[PDB]
PDB file of all heavy atoms in Angstrom:
ATOM      1  N   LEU A 310     210.049 149.742 155.543  1.00  0.00           N
ATOM      2  CA  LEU A 310     209.225 150.148 154.492  1.00  0.00           C
ATOM      3  C   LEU A 310     208.801 148.855 153.696  1.00  0.00           C
ATOM      4  O   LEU A 310     209.709 148.272 153.085  1.00  0.00           O
ATOM      5  CB  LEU A 310     209.734 151.254 153.588  1.00  0.00           C
ATOM      6  CG  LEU A 310     209.829 152.675 154.190  1.00  0.00           C
ATOM      7  CD1 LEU A 310     210.264 153.594 153.073  1.00  0.00           C
ATOM      8  CD2 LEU A 310     208.375 152.934 154.672  1.00  0.00           C
ATOM      9  N   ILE A 311     207.467 148.688 153.613  1.00  0.00           N
ATOM     10  CA  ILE A 311     206.954 147.619 152.717  1.00  0.00           C
ATOM     11  C   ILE A 311     206.488 148.271 151.407  1.00  0.00           C
ATOM     12  O   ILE A 311     205.588 149.043 151.442  1.00  0.00           O
ATOM     13  CB  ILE A 311     205.874 146.863 153.485  1.00  0.00           C
ATOM     14  CG1 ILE A 311     206.418 146.085 154.647  1.00  0.00           C
ATOM     15  CG2 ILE A 311     205.106 145.930 152.416  1.00  0.00           C
ATOM     16  CD1 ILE A 311     205.423 145.435 155.489  1.00  0.00           C
ATOM     17  N   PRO A 312     207.070 147.905 150.255  1.00  0.00           N
ATOM     18  CA  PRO A 312     206.669 148.464 149.031  1.00  0.00           C
ATOM     19  C   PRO A 312     205.114 148.175 148.656  1.00  0.00           C
ATOM     20  O   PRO A 312     204.647 146.940 149.078  1.00  0.00           O
ATOM     21  CB  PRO A 312     207.590 147.847 147.952  1.00  0.00           C
ATOM     22  CG  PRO A 312     207.994 146.608 148.591  1.00  0.00           C
ATOM     23  CD  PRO A 312     208.073 146.853 150.002  1.00  0.00           C
ATOM     24  N   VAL A 313     204.520 149.037 148.021  1.00  0.00           N
ATOM     25  CA  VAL A 313     203.015 148.827 147.753  1.00  0.00           C
ATOM     26  C   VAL A 313     202.711 149.135 146.269  1.00  0.00           C
ATOM     27  O   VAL A 313     202.168 148.362 145.537  1.00  0.00           O
ATOM     28  CB  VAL A 313     202.143 149.747 148.625  1.00  0.00           C
ATOM     29  CG1 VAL A 313     200.742 149.787 148.231  1.00  0.00           C
ATOM     30  CG2 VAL A 313     202.219 149.277 150.089  1.00  0.00           C
ATOM     31  N   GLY A 314     203.065 150.339 145.831  1.00  0.00           N
ATOM     32  CA  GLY A 314     202.699 150.844 144.517  1.00  0.00           C
ATOM     33  C   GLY A 314     203.350 151.917 144.037  1.00  0.00           C
ATOM     34  O   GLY A 314     204.456 152.370 144.538  1.00  0.00           O
ATOM     35  N   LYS A 315     202.746 152.657 143.039  1.00  0.00           N
ATOM     36  CA  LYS A 315     203.419 153.735 142.222  1.00  0.00           C
ATOM     37  C   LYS A 315     202.347 154.768 141.994  1.00  0.00           C
ATOM     38  O   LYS A 315     201.267 154.528 141.634  1.00  0.00           O
ATOM     39  CB  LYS A 315     204.022 153.254 140.996  1.00  0.00           C
ATOM     40  CG  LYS A 315     205.182 153.938 140.492  1.00  0.00           C
ATOM     41  CD  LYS A 315     206.299 153.740 141.552  1.00  0.00           C
ATOM     42  CE  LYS A 315     207.645 153.984 140.940  1.00  0.00           C
ATOM     43  NZ  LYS A 315     208.828 153.927 141.858  1.00  0.00           N
ATOM     44  N   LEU A 316     202.753 156.028 142.306  1.00  0.00           N
ATOM     45  CA  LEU A 316     201.953 157.213 141.965  1.00  0.00           C
ATOM     46  C   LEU A 316     202.614 157.973 140.724  1.00  0.00           C
ATOM     47  O   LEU A 316     203.789 158.235 140.848  1.00  0.00           O
ATOM     48  CB  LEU A 316     201.854 158.182 143.154  1.00  0.00           C
ATOM     49  CG  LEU A 316     201.424 157.647 144.512  1.00  0.00           C
ATOM     50  CD1 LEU A 316     201.700 158.647 145.583  1.00  0.00           C
ATOM     51  CD2 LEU A 316     199.929 157.332 144.431  1.00  0.00           C
ATOM     52  N   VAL A 317     201.842 158.168 139.688  1.00  0.00           N
ATOM     53  CA  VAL A 317     202.410 158.823 138.492  1.00  0.00           C
ATOM     54  C   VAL A 317     201.399 159.976 138.167  1.00  0.00           C
ATOM     55  O   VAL A 317     200.172 159.762 138.133  1.00  0.00           O
ATOM     56  CB  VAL A 317     202.404 157.807 137.357  1.00  0.00           C
ATOM     57  CG1 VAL A 317     203.103 158.488 136.078  1.00  0.00           C
ATOM     58  CG2 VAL A 317     203.223 156.602 137.721  1.00  0.00           C
ATOM     59  N   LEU A 318     201.958 161.112 137.795  1.00  0.00           N
ATOM     60  CA  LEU A 318     201.195 162.265 137.476  1.00  0.00           C
ATOM     61  C   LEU A 318     201.437 162.576 135.934  1.00  0.00           C
ATOM     62  O   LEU A 318     202.655 163.084 135.580  1.00  0.00           O
ATOM     63  CB  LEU A 318     201.551 163.500 138.293  1.00  0.00           C
ATOM     64  CG  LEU A 318     200.997 163.559 139.753  1.00  0.00           C
ATOM     65  CD1 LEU A 318     201.691 164.739 140.467  1.00  0.00           C
ATOM     66  CD2 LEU A 318     199.483 163.543 139.792  1.00  0.00           C
ATOM     67  N   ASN A 319     200.502 162.394 135.102  1.00  0.00           N
ATOM     68  CA  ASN A 319     200.728 162.355 133.572  1.00  0.00           C
ATOM     69  C   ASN A 319     199.798 163.441 132.919  1.00  0.00           C
ATOM     70  O   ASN A 319     199.822 163.380 131.650  1.00  0.00           O
ATOM     71  CB  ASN A 319     200.753 161.121 132.946  1.00  0.00           C
ATOM     72  CG  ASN A 319     199.373 160.341 133.062  1.00  0.00           C
ATOM     73  OD1 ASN A 319     198.337 160.954 133.598  1.00  0.00           O
ATOM     74  ND2 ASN A 319     199.214 159.272 132.519  1.00  0.00           N
ATOM     75  N   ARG A 320     199.021 164.206 133.620  1.00  0.00           N
ATOM     76  CA  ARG A 320     198.032 165.083 132.991  1.00  0.00           C
ATOM     77  C   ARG A 320     197.967 166.409 133.716  1.00  0.00           C
ATOM     78  O   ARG A 320     197.686 166.361 134.900  1.00  0.00           O
ATOM     79  CB  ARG A 320     196.685 164.484 132.887  1.00  0.00           C
ATOM     80  CG  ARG A 320     195.747 165.264 132.100  1.00  0.00           C
ATOM     81  CD  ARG A 320     194.431 164.587 131.782  1.00  0.00           C
ATOM     82  NE  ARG A 320     193.745 164.123 133.064  1.00  0.00           N
ATOM     83  CZ  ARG A 320     192.908 164.912 133.740  1.00  0.00           C
ATOM     84  NH1 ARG A 320     192.764 166.159 133.393  1.00  0.00           N
ATOM     85  NH2 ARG A 320     192.346 164.439 134.846  1.00  0.00           N
ATOM     86  N   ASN A 321     198.245 167.485 133.019  1.00  0.00           N
ATOM     87  CA  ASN A 321     197.983 168.876 133.605  1.00  0.00           C
ATOM     88  C   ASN A 321     196.521 169.105 133.714  1.00  0.00           C
ATOM     89  O   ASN A 321     195.748 168.553 132.980  1.00  0.00           O
ATOM     90  CB  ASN A 321     198.721 169.879 132.754  1.00  0.00           C
ATOM     91  CG  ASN A 321     200.123 170.118 133.180  1.00  0.00           C
ATOM     92  OD1 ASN A 321     200.547 170.014 134.206  1.00  0.00           O
ATOM     93  ND2 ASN A 321     200.974 170.308 132.111  1.00  0.00           N
ATOM     94  N   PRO A 322     196.157 170.062 134.627  1.00  0.00           N
ATOM     95  CA  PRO A 322     194.761 170.453 134.655  1.00  0.00           C
ATOM     96  C   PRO A 322     194.350 171.316 133.443  1.00  0.00           C
ATOM     97  O   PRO A 322     195.354 171.974 132.863  1.00  0.00           O
ATOM     98  CB  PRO A 322     194.709 171.298 135.917  1.00  0.00           C
ATOM     99  CG  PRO A 322     196.026 171.730 136.211  1.00  0.00           C
ATOM    100  CD  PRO A 322     196.935 170.639 135.741  1.00  0.00           C
ATOM    101  N   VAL A 323     193.122 171.314 133.048  1.00  0.00           N
ATOM    102  CA  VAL A 323     192.774 172.091 131.931  1.00  0.00           C
ATOM    103  C   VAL A 323     192.259 173.462 132.371  1.00  0.00           C
ATOM    104  O   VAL A 323     192.533 174.495 131.718  1.00  0.00           O
ATOM    105  CB  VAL A 323     191.701 171.237 131.129  1.00  0.00           C
ATOM    106  CG1 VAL A 323     191.176 172.147 130.019  1.00  0.00           C
ATOM    107  CG2 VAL A 323     192.167 169.988 130.690  1.00  0.00           C
ATOM    108  N   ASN A 324     191.470 173.559 133.427  1.00  0.00           N
ATOM    109  CA  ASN A 324     191.102 174.769 134.050  1.00  0.00           C
ATOM    110  C   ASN A 324     191.449 174.755 135.483  1.00  0.00           C
ATOM    111  O   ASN A 324     190.860 173.996 136.310  1.00  0.00           O
ATOM    112  CB  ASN A 324     189.551 175.022 133.873  1.00  0.00           C
ATOM    113  CG  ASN A 324     189.116 176.377 134.352  1.00  0.00           C
ATOM    114  OD1 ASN A 324     188.808 176.520 135.609  1.00  0.00           O
ATOM    115  ND2 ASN A 324     189.059 177.423 133.615  1.00  0.00           N
ATOM    116  N   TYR A 325     192.408 175.647 135.904  1.00  0.00           N
ATOM    117  CA  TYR A 325     192.977 175.589 137.268  1.00  0.00           C
ATOM    118  C   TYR A 325     191.952 175.779 138.307  1.00  0.00           C
ATOM    119  O   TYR A 325     191.846 175.002 139.282  1.00  0.00           O
ATOM    120  CB  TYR A 325     194.070 176.663 137.431  1.00  0.00           C
ATOM    121  CG  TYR A 325     194.662 176.695 138.799  1.00  0.00           C
ATOM    122  CD1 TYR A 325     195.961 175.953 139.076  1.00  0.00           C
ATOM    123  CD2 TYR A 325     194.235 177.477 139.835  1.00  0.00           C
ATOM    124  CE1 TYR A 325     196.497 176.068 140.237  1.00  0.00           C
ATOM    125  CE2 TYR A 325     194.720 177.470 141.018  1.00  0.00           C
ATOM    126  CZ  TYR A 325     195.926 176.802 141.339  1.00  0.00           C
ATOM    127  OH  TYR A 325     196.570 176.800 142.496  1.00  0.00           O
ATOM    128  N   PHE A 326     191.130 176.813 138.116  1.00  0.00           N
ATOM    129  CA  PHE A 326     190.078 177.051 139.231  1.00  0.00           C
ATOM    130  C   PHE A 326     189.128 175.866 139.354  1.00  0.00           C
ATOM    131  O   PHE A 326     188.713 175.607 140.469  1.00  0.00           O
ATOM    132  CB  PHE A 326     189.318 178.400 138.860  1.00  0.00           C
ATOM    133  CG  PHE A 326     188.252 178.700 139.776  1.00  0.00           C
ATOM    134  CD1 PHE A 326     188.426 179.391 140.986  1.00  0.00           C
ATOM    135  CD2 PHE A 326     186.886 178.274 139.585  1.00  0.00           C
ATOM    136  CE1 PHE A 326     187.448 179.740 141.897  1.00  0.00           C
ATOM    137  CE2 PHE A 326     185.892 178.565 140.449  1.00  0.00           C
ATOM    138  CZ  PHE A 326     186.149 179.279 141.600  1.00  0.00           C
ATOM    139  N   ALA A 327     188.716 175.343 138.276  1.00  0.00           N
ATOM    140  CA  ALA A 327     187.689 174.240 138.282  1.00  0.00           C
ATOM    141  C   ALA A 327     188.264 172.951 138.799  1.00  0.00           C
ATOM    142  O   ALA A 327     187.619 172.214 139.487  1.00  0.00           O
ATOM    143  CB  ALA A 327     187.060 174.056 136.924  1.00  0.00           C
ATOM    144  N   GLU A 328     189.574 172.719 138.507  1.00  0.00           N
ATOM    145  CA  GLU A 328     190.198 171.427 138.827  1.00  0.00           C
ATOM    146  C   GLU A 328     191.099 171.407 140.018  1.00  0.00           C
ATOM    147  O   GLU A 328     191.294 170.438 140.726  1.00  0.00           O
ATOM    148  CB  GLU A 328     191.014 170.937 137.586  1.00  0.00           C
ATOM    149  CG  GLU A 328     190.130 170.612 136.434  1.00  0.00           C
ATOM    150  CD  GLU A 328     190.927 170.116 135.229  1.00  0.00           C
ATOM    151  OE1 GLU A 328     191.723 169.242 135.423  1.00  0.00           O
ATOM    152  OE2 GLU A 328     190.759 170.663 134.072  1.00  0.00           O
ATOM    153  N   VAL A 329     191.773 172.507 140.333  1.00  0.00           N
ATOM    154  CA  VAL A 329     192.794 172.655 141.370  1.00  0.00           C
ATOM    155  C   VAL A 329     192.198 173.509 142.554  1.00  0.00           C
ATOM    156  O   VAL A 329     192.224 173.035 143.702  1.00  0.00           O
ATOM    157  CB  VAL A 329     194.133 173.135 140.914  1.00  0.00           C
ATOM    158  CG1 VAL A 329     195.139 173.161 141.986  1.00  0.00           C
ATOM    159  CG2 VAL A 329     194.631 172.397 139.746  1.00  0.00           C
ATOM    160  N   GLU A 330     191.700 174.625 142.307  1.00  0.00           N
ATOM    161  CA  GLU A 330     191.270 175.602 143.338  1.00  0.00           C
ATOM    162  C   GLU A 330     190.021 174.914 144.050  1.00  0.00           C
ATOM    163  O   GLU A 330     189.852 175.100 145.248  1.00  0.00           O
ATOM    164  CB  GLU A 330     190.970 176.938 142.865  1.00  0.00           C
ATOM    165  CG  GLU A 330     190.725 177.937 143.951  1.00  0.00           C
ATOM    166  CD  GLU A 330     191.914 178.134 144.867  1.00  0.00           C
ATOM    167  OE1 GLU A 330     193.007 177.975 144.409  1.00  0.00           O
ATOM    168  OE2 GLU A 330     191.727 178.542 146.001  1.00  0.00           O
ATOM    169  N   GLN A 331     189.190 174.350 143.265  1.00  0.00           N
ATOM    170  CA  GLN A 331     187.862 173.795 143.762  1.00  0.00           C
ATOM    171  C   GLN A 331     187.944 172.381 144.320  1.00  0.00           C
ATOM    172  O   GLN A 331     186.964 171.842 144.754  1.00  0.00           O
ATOM    173  CB  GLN A 331     186.816 173.867 142.666  1.00  0.00           C
ATOM    174  CG  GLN A 331     186.197 175.282 142.549  1.00  0.00           C
ATOM    175  CD  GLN A 331     184.945 175.249 141.638  1.00  0.00           C
ATOM    176  OE1 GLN A 331     183.968 176.028 141.886  1.00  0.00           O
ATOM    177  NE2 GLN A 331     184.943 174.400 140.635  1.00  0.00           N
ATOM    178  N   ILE A 332     189.079 171.673 144.207  1.00  0.00           N
ATOM    179  CA  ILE A 332     189.240 170.337 144.679  1.00  0.00           C
ATOM    180  C   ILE A 332     189.306 170.344 146.152  1.00  0.00           C
ATOM    181  O   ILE A 332     189.841 171.248 146.775  1.00  0.00           O
ATOM    182  CB  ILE A 332     190.448 169.641 144.020  1.00  0.00           C
ATOM    183  CG1 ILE A 332     190.276 168.111 144.107  1.00  0.00           C
ATOM    184  CG2 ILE A 332     191.779 170.118 144.647  1.00  0.00           C
ATOM    185  CD1 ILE A 332     191.500 167.374 143.558  1.00  0.00           C
ATOM    186  N   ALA A 333     188.715 169.304 146.773  1.00  0.00           N
ATOM    187  CA  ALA A 333     188.575 169.264 148.209  1.00  0.00           C
ATOM    188  C   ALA A 333     188.978 167.831 148.621  1.00  0.00           C
ATOM    189  O   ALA A 333     188.346 166.856 148.200  1.00  0.00           O
ATOM    190  CB  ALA A 333     187.167 169.599 148.665  1.00  0.00           C
ATOM    191  N   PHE A 334     189.852 167.770 149.561  1.00  0.00           N
ATOM    192  CA  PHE A 334     190.294 166.371 150.176  1.00  0.00           C
ATOM    193  C   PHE A 334     189.747 166.362 151.499  1.00  0.00           C
ATOM    194  O   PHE A 334     189.940 167.273 152.361  1.00  0.00           O
ATOM    195  CB  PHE A 334     191.768 166.203 150.116  1.00  0.00           C
ATOM    196  CG  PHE A 334     192.332 166.454 148.798  1.00  0.00           C
ATOM    197  CD1 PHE A 334     192.801 167.837 148.540  1.00  0.00           C
ATOM    198  CD2 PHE A 334     192.500 165.513 147.903  1.00  0.00           C
ATOM    199  CE1 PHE A 334     193.439 168.030 147.258  1.00  0.00           C
ATOM    200  CE2 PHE A 334     193.115 165.793 146.675  1.00  0.00           C
ATOM    201  CZ  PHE A 334     193.578 167.065 146.372  1.00  0.00           C
ATOM    202  N   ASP A 335     189.154 165.247 151.934  1.00  0.00           N
ATOM    203  CA  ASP A 335     188.706 164.912 153.259  1.00  0.00           C
ATOM    204  C   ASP A 335     189.425 163.704 153.830  1.00  0.00           C
ATOM    205  O   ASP A 335     189.177 162.607 153.328  1.00  0.00           O
ATOM    206  CB  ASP A 335     187.217 164.762 153.412  1.00  0.00           C
ATOM    207  CG  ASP A 335     186.394 165.928 152.892  1.00  0.00           C
ATOM    208  OD1 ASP A 335     186.842 167.072 153.135  1.00  0.00           O
ATOM    209  OD2 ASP A 335     185.364 165.762 152.148  1.00  0.00           O
ATOM    210  N   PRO A 336     190.299 163.778 154.803  1.00  0.00           N
ATOM    211  CA  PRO A 336     190.860 162.604 155.392  1.00  0.00           C
ATOM    212  C   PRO A 336     189.756 161.569 155.880  1.00  0.00           C
ATOM    213  O   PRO A 336     190.036 160.312 156.002  1.00  0.00           O
ATOM    214  CB  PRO A 336     191.632 163.097 156.619  1.00  0.00           C
ATOM    215  CG  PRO A 336     192.014 164.471 156.156  1.00  0.00           C
ATOM    216  CD  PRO A 336     190.859 164.950 155.328  1.00  0.00           C
ATOM    217  N   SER A 337     188.535 162.034 156.110  1.00  0.00           N
ATOM    218  CA  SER A 337     187.403 161.053 156.366  1.00  0.00           C
ATOM    219  C   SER A 337     187.021 160.223 155.270  1.00  0.00           C
ATOM    220  O   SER A 337     186.329 159.176 155.471  1.00  0.00           O
ATOM    221  CB  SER A 337     186.244 161.888 156.936  1.00  0.00           C
ATOM    222  OG  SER A 337     185.752 162.751 155.804  1.00  0.00           O
ATOM    223  N   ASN A 338     187.337 160.587 154.098  1.00  0.00           N
ATOM    224  CA  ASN A 338     187.059 159.787 152.841  1.00  0.00           C
ATOM    225  C   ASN A 338     187.957 158.620 152.845  1.00  0.00           C
ATOM    226  O   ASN A 338     189.084 158.699 152.381  1.00  0.00           O
ATOM    227  CB  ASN A 338     187.168 160.609 151.565  1.00  0.00           C
ATOM    228  CG  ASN A 338     186.073 161.562 151.376  1.00  0.00           C
ATOM    229  OD1 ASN A 338     184.972 161.418 151.975  1.00  0.00           O
ATOM    230  ND2 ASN A 338     186.230 162.567 150.581  1.00  0.00           N
ATOM    231  N   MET A 339     187.571 157.479 153.355  1.00  0.00           N
ATOM    232  CA  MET A 339     188.282 156.224 153.360  1.00  0.00           C
ATOM    233  C   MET A 339     187.353 155.125 152.975  1.00  0.00           C
ATOM    234  O   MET A 339     186.263 155.012 153.512  1.00  0.00           O
ATOM    235  CB  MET A 339     188.962 156.086 154.747  1.00  0.00           C
ATOM    236  CG  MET A 339     190.106 156.996 155.117  1.00  0.00           C
ATOM    237  SD  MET A 339     190.618 156.810 156.805  1.00  0.00           S
ATOM    238  CE  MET A 339     189.120 157.464 157.651  1.00  0.00           C
ATOM    239  N   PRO A 340     187.819 154.255 152.099  1.00  0.00           N
ATOM    240  CA  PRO A 340     186.951 153.079 151.749  1.00  0.00           C
ATOM    241  C   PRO A 340     187.167 151.937 152.723  1.00  0.00           C
ATOM    242  O   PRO A 340     188.119 152.005 153.554  1.00  0.00           O
ATOM    243  CB  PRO A 340     187.451 152.769 150.281  1.00  0.00           C
ATOM    244  CG  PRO A 340     188.948 153.076 150.479  1.00  0.00           C
ATOM    245  CD  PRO A 340     188.997 154.297 151.266  1.00  0.00           C
ATOM    246  N   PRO A 341     186.370 150.874 152.593  1.00  0.00           N
ATOM    247  CA  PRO A 341     186.611 149.694 153.363  1.00  0.00           C
ATOM    248  C   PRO A 341     188.125 149.150 153.243  1.00  0.00           C
ATOM    249  O   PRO A 341     188.660 149.222 152.077  1.00  0.00           O
ATOM    250  CB  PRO A 341     185.664 148.657 152.851  1.00  0.00           C
ATOM    251  CG  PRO A 341     184.537 149.422 152.371  1.00  0.00           C
ATOM    252  CD  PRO A 341     185.124 150.684 151.823  1.00  0.00           C
ATOM    253  N   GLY A 342     188.637 148.583 154.308  1.00  0.00           N
ATOM    254  CA  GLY A 342     190.004 148.243 154.329  1.00  0.00           C
ATOM    255  C   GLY A 342     191.009 149.342 154.790  1.00  0.00           C
ATOM    256  O   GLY A 342     192.207 149.103 154.972  1.00  0.00           O
ATOM    257  N   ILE A 343     190.440 150.592 155.029  1.00  0.00           N
ATOM    258  CA  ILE A 343     191.282 151.628 155.444  1.00  0.00           C
ATOM    259  C   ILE A 343     190.471 152.475 156.535  1.00  0.00           C
ATOM    260  O   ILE A 343     189.362 152.858 156.237  1.00  0.00           O
ATOM    261  CB  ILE A 343     191.661 152.641 154.365  1.00  0.00           C
ATOM    262  CG1 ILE A 343     192.501 151.911 153.248  1.00  0.00           C
ATOM    263  CG2 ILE A 343     192.410 153.848 154.798  1.00  0.00           C
ATOM    264  CD1 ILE A 343     192.799 152.662 151.958  1.00  0.00           C
ATOM    265  N   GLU A 344     190.999 152.603 157.719  1.00  0.00           N
ATOM    266  CA  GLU A 344     190.278 153.200 158.794  1.00  0.00           C
ATOM    267  C   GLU A 344     191.229 154.186 159.484  1.00  0.00           C
ATOM    268  O   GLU A 344     192.451 154.235 159.303  1.00  0.00           O
ATOM    269  CB  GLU A 344     189.839 152.087 159.825  1.00  0.00           C
ATOM    270  CG  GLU A 344     189.141 150.885 159.219  1.00  0.00           C
ATOM    271  CD  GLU A 344     187.993 150.400 159.987  1.00  0.00           C
ATOM    272  OE1 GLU A 344     187.937 150.684 161.230  1.00  0.00           O
ATOM    273  OE2 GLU A 344     187.119 149.782 159.441  1.00  0.00           O
ATOM    274  N   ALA A 345     190.599 154.983 160.380  1.00  0.00           N
ATOM    275  CA  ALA A 345     191.243 155.957 161.227  1.00  0.00           C
ATOM    276  C   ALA A 345     191.816 155.333 162.516  1.00  0.00           C
ATOM    277  O   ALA A 345     191.321 154.302 162.966  1.00  0.00           O
ATOM    278  CB  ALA A 345     190.407 157.165 161.586  1.00  0.00           C
ATOM    279  N   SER A 346     192.951 155.943 163.034  1.00  0.00           N
ATOM    280  CA  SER A 346     193.479 155.521 164.272  1.00  0.00           C
ATOM    281  C   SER A 346     193.137 156.485 165.339  1.00  0.00           C
ATOM    282  O   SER A 346     192.624 157.601 165.053  1.00  0.00           O
ATOM    283  CB  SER A 346     194.990 155.475 164.157  1.00  0.00           C
ATOM    284  OG  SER A 346     195.637 156.642 164.125  1.00  0.00           O
ATOM    285  N   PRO A 347     193.336 156.174 166.621  1.00  0.00           N
ATOM    286  CA  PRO A 347     193.043 157.154 167.629  1.00  0.00           C
ATOM    287  C   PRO A 347     193.944 158.346 167.683  1.00  0.00           C
ATOM    288  O   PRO A 347     193.821 159.094 168.701  1.00  0.00           O
ATOM    289  CB  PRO A 347     193.130 156.269 168.963  1.00  0.00           C
ATOM    290  CG  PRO A 347     193.970 155.168 168.633  1.00  0.00           C
ATOM    291  CD  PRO A 347     193.679 154.774 167.157  1.00  0.00           C
ATOM    292  N   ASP A 348     194.754 158.479 166.773  1.00  0.00           N
ATOM    293  CA  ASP A 348     195.533 159.790 166.603  1.00  0.00           C
ATOM    294  C   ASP A 348     194.685 160.979 166.829  1.00  0.00           C
ATOM    295  O   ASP A 348     193.780 161.215 165.851  1.00  0.00           O
ATOM    296  CB  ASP A 348     196.266 159.878 165.221  1.00  0.00           C
ATOM    297  CG  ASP A 348     197.301 160.863 165.172  1.00  0.00           C
ATOM    298  OD1 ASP A 348     197.178 161.940 165.866  1.00  0.00           O
ATOM    299  OD2 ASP A 348     198.294 160.787 164.352  1.00  0.00           O
ATOM    300  N   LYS A 349     194.775 161.611 167.940  1.00  0.00           N
ATOM    301  CA  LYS A 349     193.915 162.855 168.176  1.00  0.00           C
ATOM    302  C   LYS A 349     193.934 163.811 166.998  1.00  0.00           C
ATOM    303  O   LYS A 349     192.848 164.387 166.782  1.00  0.00           O
ATOM    304  CB  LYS A 349     194.367 163.491 169.523  1.00  0.00           C
ATOM    305  CG  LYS A 349     194.329 162.530 170.721  1.00  0.00           C
ATOM    306  CD  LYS A 349     194.682 163.382 171.980  1.00  0.00           C
ATOM    307  CE  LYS A 349     194.665 162.401 173.211  1.00  0.00           C
ATOM    308  NZ  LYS A 349     195.001 163.162 174.431  1.00  0.00           N
ATOM    309  N   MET A 350     195.147 164.081 166.450  1.00  0.00           N
ATOM    310  CA  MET A 350     195.178 165.014 165.319  1.00  0.00           C
ATOM    311  C   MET A 350     194.358 164.637 164.227  1.00  0.00           C
ATOM    312  O   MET A 350     193.560 165.374 163.617  1.00  0.00           O
ATOM    313  CB  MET A 350     196.592 165.278 164.884  1.00  0.00           C
ATOM    314  CG  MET A 350     197.378 165.909 165.998  1.00  0.00           C
ATOM    315  SD  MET A 350     197.133 167.655 165.992  1.00  0.00           S
ATOM    316  CE  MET A 350     197.903 168.246 164.581  1.00  0.00           C
ATOM    317  N   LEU A 351     194.535 163.368 163.755  1.00  0.00           N
ATOM    318  CA  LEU A 351     193.643 162.809 162.688  1.00  0.00           C
ATOM    319  C   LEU A 351     192.162 162.832 163.043  1.00  0.00           C
ATOM    320  O   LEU A 351     191.297 163.152 162.222  1.00  0.00           O
ATOM    321  CB  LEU A 351     194.098 161.408 162.370  1.00  0.00           C
ATOM    322  CG  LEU A 351     193.205 160.695 161.238  1.00  0.00           C
ATOM    323  CD1 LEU A 351     193.478 161.496 159.892  1.00  0.00           C
ATOM    324  CD2 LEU A 351     193.590 159.233 161.014  1.00  0.00           C
ATOM    325  N   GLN A 352     191.820 162.502 164.371  1.00  0.00           N
ATOM    326  CA  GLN A 352     190.470 162.527 164.865  1.00  0.00           C
ATOM    327  C   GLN A 352     189.867 163.975 164.598  1.00  0.00           C
ATOM    328  O   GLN A 352     188.736 164.094 164.267  1.00  0.00           O
ATOM    329  CB  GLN A 352     190.353 162.061 166.281  1.00  0.00           C
ATOM    330  CG  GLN A 352     190.778 160.591 166.480  1.00  0.00           C
ATOM    331  CD  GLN A 352     189.675 159.655 166.195  1.00  0.00           C
ATOM    332  OE1 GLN A 352     188.507 159.941 166.491  1.00  0.00           O
ATOM    333  NE2 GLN A 352     190.000 158.513 165.590  1.00  0.00           N
ATOM    334  N   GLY A 353     190.693 164.981 164.851  1.00  0.00           N
ATOM    335  CA  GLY A 353     190.244 166.354 164.693  1.00  0.00           C
ATOM    336  C   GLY A 353     190.038 166.660 163.241  1.00  0.00           C
ATOM    337  O   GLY A 353     189.079 167.352 162.861  1.00  0.00           O
TER     338      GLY A 353
END
């Protein structure tokens, strides 16, 4: 394991439906410097 950084959660949501229920993550969302591998599962 190569250390990189820190994740900290310091703020609760204000409106759960607007902030948590409606949030959407796409593994396809990747900036330059981060790419997908031929992992068939990730490809799907």
Side-chain angles (χ1 to χ4, degrees):
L310 279 189
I311 292 175
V313 169
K315 214 61 161 174
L316 307 166
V317 185
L318 290 172
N319 65 0
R320 186 170 59 82
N321 275 322
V323 180
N324 184 273
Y325 178 95
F326 178 86
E328 292 177 54
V329 185
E330 189 63 28
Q331 281 192 146
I332 199 181
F334 310 91
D335 304 319
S337 63
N338 286 339
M339 288 171 293
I343 299 173
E344 312 218 338
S346 77
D348 189 336
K349 300 185 182 181
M350 290 286 287
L351 179 65
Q352 296 278 323

